[PDB]
């Protein structure tokens, strides 16, 4: 069933941007969704998303742009110990020149660059690039 609500959503916003779809809604919604999408907003990977408030769960509607090649999700949230952060961002991103492993540490949800500035580890969620 709905186990992981990212994988759910991120499939459907990778899986639109292939078709070139202009915008998409994501059915279940969550806090973690919002908080990881707002990360994608900063590096440009999407445009402004506007969350509907069906009284229950939430829907979102994501303005897409052309720019997202793929976003995916590492499904079990392994615990990343900062020394490993490299070994991951080697084998999970296309280059050292862009690509963003979104993860979730002590000091909020954020990309790997921002966990490195603050010097924290924590749990991998996914990656967009």
């Amino acid at each position: 069933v709905r186990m992981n609500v990212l994988a759910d959503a991120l499939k459907s916003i990778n899986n639109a941007e292939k078709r070139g779809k202009r915008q998409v809604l994501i059915r279940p919604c969550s806090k973690v969704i919002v908080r990881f999408l707002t990360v994608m907003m900063k590096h440009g990977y999407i445009g402004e998303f506007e969350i509907i408030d069906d009284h229950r769960a939430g829907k979102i509607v994501v303005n897409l742009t052309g720019r997202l090649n793929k976003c995916g999700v590492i499904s079990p949230r392994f615990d990343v110990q900062l020394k490993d952060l490299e070994k991951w961002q080697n084998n999970l991103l296309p280059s050292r020149q862009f690509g963003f492993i979104v993860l979730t540490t002590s000091a909020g949800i954020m990309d790997h660059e921002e966990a490195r500035r603050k010097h924290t580890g924590g749990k991998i969620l996914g990656f967009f690039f």
């Binding site: 499904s75 079990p76 949230r77 392994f78």
Partner: protein, 141 residues
């Protein structure tokens, strides 16, 4: 698909464990059989006594007689055919003469022709065929 979860380190380990008794190359190595079966008791070469000289008929596409030796190994008393490599060297080896027999390179496969002959002769009465068939060291007497 695969089990993929996070407290699944065992279902995984124990999965990748048994699905090696379906590997062939480990069930030689880790089972028992091999050490029990190969006259060469896990041992690179072995010494044995030449009990007679036997020509073997090669596998159809290539007709020829191969010129091997029935050996009996010391350590086991297990018998053997070993193809005496290189031309006219069977001529050297006489009966009841102590030979150091090594493998063929296929470790169990019989090589090419020589149907069902894993072993090749190397030494003969502490000499080495390579020295004899070159004519460097003569036959001892």
């Amino acid at each position: 698909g695969k089990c993929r979860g996070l407290r699944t380190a065992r279902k995984l380990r124990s999965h990748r464990r048994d699905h090696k008794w379906h590997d062939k190359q480990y069930k030689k190595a880790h089972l028992g059989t091999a050490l029990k079966a190969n006259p060469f008791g896990g041992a690179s070469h072995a010494k044995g006594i030449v009990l007679e000289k036997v020509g073997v008929e090669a596998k159809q596409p290539n007709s020829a007689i191969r010129k091997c030796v029935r050996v009996q190994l010391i350590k086991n008393g297990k018998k053997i055919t070993a193809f005496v490599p290189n031309d006219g060297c069977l001529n050297f080896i006489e009966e009841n003469d102590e030979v150091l027999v090594a493998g063929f390179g296929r470790k169990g496969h019989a090589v090419g022709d020589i149907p069902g002959v894993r072993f090749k002769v190397v030494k003969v009465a502490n000499v080495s065929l390579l020295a004899l068939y070159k004519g460097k060291k003569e036959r001892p007497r």
